[PDB]
Protein backbone atom coordinates (compact mmCIF):
# COMPACT_ATOMS: atom_id res chain seq x y z
CA UNK A 1 0.00 0.00 0.00
CA UNK A 2 2.88 2.41 0.69
CA UNK A 3 5.03 0.92 -2.09
CA UNK A 4 3.60 3.42 -4.60
CA UNK A 5 3.48 6.13 -1.90
CA UNK A 6 7.30 6.04 -1.64
CA UNK A 7 10.16 6.85 -4.05
CA UNK A 8 11.07 3.17 -4.64
CA UNK A 9 14.84 3.70 -4.92
CA UNK A 10 14.69 5.22 -1.41
CA UNK A 11 13.59 1.83 -0.04
CA UNK A 12 16.42 0.11 -1.94
CA UNK A 13 19.05 2.21 -0.13
CA UNK A 14 17.73 1.75 3.40
CA UNK A 15 17.10 -2.01 3.11
CA UNK A 16 20.42 -2.43 1.28
CA UNK A 17 22.13 -0.79 4.28
CA UNK A 18 20.39 -2.95 6.93
CA UNK A 19 19.95 -6.30 5.06
CA UNK A 20 22.69 -7.59 7.40
CA UNK A 21 21.48 -9.72 10.29
CA UNK A 22 21.48 -7.05 12.99
CA UNK A 23 22.58 -3.98 11.00
CA UNK A 24 19.19 -2.25 11.32
CA UNK A 25 18.76 0.58 13.83
CA UNK A 26 15.71 2.68 12.79
CA UNK A 27 17.29 6.16 12.40
CA UNK A 28 19.61 5.64 9.40
CA UNK A 29 16.94 3.45 7.75
CA UNK A 30 13.88 5.73 8.00
CA UNK A 31 16.10 8.78 7.42
CA UNK A 32 17.17 7.13 4.14
CA UNK A 33 13.84 5.86 2.73
CA UNK A 34 12.45 9.34 3.49
CA UNK A 35 9.49 8.53 5.78
CA UNK A 36 10.16 11.70 7.81
CA UNK A 37 9.74 13.76 4.62
CA UNK A 38 6.04 12.81 4.64
CA UNK A 39 3.70 15.22 6.48
CA UNK A 40 2.37 14.43 9.99
CA UNK A 41 -0.98 13.71 8.27
CA UNK A 42 0.49 11.42 5.60
CA UNK A 43 2.45 9.94 8.50
CA UNK A 44 -0.64 9.00 10.48
CA UNK A 45 -1.56 7.22 7.25
CA UNK A 46 1.80 5.42 7.15
CA UNK A 47 1.23 4.26 10.71
CA UNK A 48 -2.36 3.22 10.05
CA UNK A 49 -0.61 0.77 7.71
CA UNK A 50 1.98 -0.25 10.32
CA UNK A 51 -1.03 -1.19 12.44
CA UNK A 52 -0.99 -4.87 11.45
CA UNK A 53 -3.83 -5.97 13.80
CA UNK A 54 -5.97 -2.90 12.95
CA UNK A 55 -5.69 -1.91 16.64
CA UNK A 56 -4.63 1.72 16.01
CA UNK A 57 -1.35 0.57 17.59
CA UNK A 58 2.13 -0.63 16.58
CA UNK A 59 2.87 -3.71 18.70
CA UNK A 60 6.16 -5.64 18.85
CA UNK A 61 4.81 -7.94 16.09
CA UNK A 62 4.31 -4.85 13.89
CA UNK A 63 7.95 -3.97 14.45
CA UNK A 64 8.83 -7.40 13.00
CA UNK A 65 7.16 -6.41 9.71
CA UNK A 66 7.39 -2.62 10.27
CA UNK A 67 8.77 -2.21 6.70
CA UNK A 68 5.91 -4.28 5.28
CA UNK A 69 4.01 -1.29 3.84
CA UNK A 70 7.13 -0.70 1.73
CA UNK A 71 7.59 -4.42 1.00
CA UNK A 72 5.25 -7.30 1.95
CA UNK A 73 8.50 -9.10 2.83
CA UNK A 74 11.31 -6.54 2.54
CA UNK A 75 13.38 -6.34 5.74
CA UNK A 76 12.82 -9.45 7.89
CA UNK A 77 13.78 -8.44 11.46
CA UNK A 78 16.54 -10.64 12.92
CA UNK A 79 14.90 -10.54 16.39
CA UNK A 80 17.65 -8.47 17.96
CA UNK A 81 16.87 -5.80 15.31
CA UNK A 82 13.31 -5.89 16.65
CA UNK A 83 14.54 -5.47 20.19
CA UNK A 84 16.19 -2.24 19.12
CA UNK A 85 13.21 -0.65 17.35
CA UNK A 86 11.05 -1.44 20.40
CA UNK A 87 13.54 0.03 22.92
CA UNK A 88 14.47 2.86 20.52
CA UNK A 89 10.95 4.07 19.73
CA UNK A 90 8.95 3.11 22.85
CA UNK A 91 9.61 6.29 24.87
CA UNK A 92 6.81 5.82 27.43
CA UNK A 93 7.97 2.17 27.60
CA UNK A 94 4.35 0.93 27.48
CA UNK A 95 4.83 -1.76 24.79
CA UNK A 96 2.72 -0.10 22.06
CA UNK A 97 3.75 2.77 19.77
CA UNK A 98 0.64 4.86 19.10
CA UNK A 99 0.72 7.53 16.37
CA UNK A 100 2.35 10.57 18.02
CA UNK A 101 4.93 8.08 19.31
CA UNK A 102 5.33 6.55 15.84
CA UNK A 103 5.15 9.81 13.78
CA UNK A 104 7.60 11.19 16.35
CA UNK A 105 10.07 8.39 15.68
CA UNK A 106 9.49 8.57 11.91
CA UNK A 107 10.36 12.28 11.72
CA UNK A 108 13.27 12.11 14.19
CA UNK A 109 14.68 9.10 12.31
CA1 LIG B 1 -1.88 -2.72 17.17
CA1 LIG C 1 5.09 4.05 23.00
Q: Please, what are the domains in the chain?
A: 1-109 (1.10.238.10)
Task: Say whether 57 counts as a known binding-site residue.
Answer: yes
**Radius of gyration of the chain from its Cα atoms, rounded to whole angstroms:** 12
Q: Across the strands, what pairs with 97?
A: 58
Q: How many residues appear in the chain?
A: 109
Q: Is residue 19 within 8 Å of residue 95, measured between CB atoms?
A: no
Nearest to 77 by CA among 16, 11, 7, 20: 20
Task: Say whether 59 counts as a known binding-site residue.
Answer: yes
Give 58: exposed, middle or buried? Use CB within 10 Å, 0-12, 13-18, 19+.
buried
Give 72: exposed, middle or buried? Use CB within 10 Å, 0-12, 13-18, 19+.
exposed
Q: Ligand 2 center to residue 100 CA distance, Å?
A: 9
Which ligand is in closest contact with the Cα of 59? 1
Residues 6+ apart with CB under 8 A from 63: 77, 82, 85, 86, 89
Q: Across the strands, what pairs with 58?
A: 97
For residues 87 and 42, give the distance between their C-alpha atoms in angstroms, rounded to a whole number: 24
Task: Say whether 69 counts as a known binding-site residue.
Answer: no
Amino acid sequence: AAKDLLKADDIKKALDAVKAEGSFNHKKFFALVGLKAMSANDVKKVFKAIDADASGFIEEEELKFVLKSFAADGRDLTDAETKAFLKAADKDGDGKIGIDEFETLVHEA
